[PDB]
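step 3/5: co-fold with nickel (II) ion
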Amino acid sequence: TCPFYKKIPGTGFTVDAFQYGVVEGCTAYFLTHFHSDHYAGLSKHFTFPVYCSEITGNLLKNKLHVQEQYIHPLPLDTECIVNGVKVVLLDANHCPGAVMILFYLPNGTVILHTGDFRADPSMERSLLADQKVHMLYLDTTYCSPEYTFPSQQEVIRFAINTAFEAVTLNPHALVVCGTYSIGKEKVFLAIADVLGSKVGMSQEKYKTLQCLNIPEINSLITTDMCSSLVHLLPMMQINFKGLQSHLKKCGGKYNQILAFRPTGWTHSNKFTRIADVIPQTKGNISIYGIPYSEHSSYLEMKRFVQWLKPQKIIPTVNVGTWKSRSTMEKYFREWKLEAGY
Ligand code: NI
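step 4/5: write C-alpha cells
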C-alpha cells in the first residue's frame, strides 16, 4: 500500500506514487523527475492528472507514451494553482527536469518536498527564502557523515584532463562512458567538447537526450558511431569483457579504451582525494570510477536543513530498517540543537 511519506496531508495529492494502482482519495499525482524508482507504473493507459516539469512531461509523452491530455507541465519559479492549492516547482539540482515542490496548504501550513536533490547554497536565494517551511519531505540518500564527495566541477576537471592527455598521447584510443538513466550528462558532454568529437550512442538514448532542452544538443550528440571517438554504453557493459567486445566491433579503428563509470559514492572517498584516483587496468583497457553525485553529501544536506529550520522532517530514503531510521532521527536532533531552532 502507499507509504505515508508519499502523501501530502490536507490535500488529495501524492508524490512519486505510480506503482500502487488507484490511490484512494488521490486527485493529482505529482512526479518529481524521470527516474524509474519514481515513475514506476506510468504508461499510455494512465488516465489521472500528472503534474511535473516541462522536461519530465516531454519524457512521459515520448518515452512512456503517456497521453497529452493527462500531462500537466508547470513552469519553474512560478506560483500555480492545482485543485485549489497553491504550488511552486523549484530546481532540485538532480538530473534534467528534476524539481522540488512547495505546497501552500489552505490552513497556512507550508510543505517542501525535495524529491531527489543535491543541496546547494544557491537554493538559499530562491523563493524558499520568502516564507517559513513547516514540514520537509527530505531526500536522505547519503544521510551519514562518511558520505563526503568532491564538487561536480572538480570531478569534471579530472575527467577532461585525463581524457585529453590519453587521446593526445594515443590518437587511436577510444573513450567510453557508462549510463543507465538520465543525469550526469556533463561527464560525456565535457569530454567530447575537449576532444572535438560528438558523443555516439544508440537511437533509444539519442531520443531520450533530445527530450531534455539542452542548448545546442544537435551539435554535441549523434547516432553515427563511426564518426565519434566518445561512445556511450549501458552501465552494465562497463567491465573488461563488455569493453573487449565493443573494441572488436570498431574494426581496428582503435587499439585502446579509456572508460568512465560515474558512480554515486564508493568507500575509496573516506581516504582518497580526487587527485589520487587511479583506474583498474587489463591489457589495453582502463576503467575509472569517478564520484560524480547528483545527491547531497552529508554536509551539503546538513547546511540546507540548518538554514531552512523546518519544524518537522520526514525522510524519504533509507526508511526500510529501524537502525537507519533511528540513526537519521539522531542526526536531525543534533542539527537542530547545534543551530538553535
Ligand atoms: Ni533520482
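step 5/5: annotate
Residues 137 and 314 are 5 Å apart (CA to CA).
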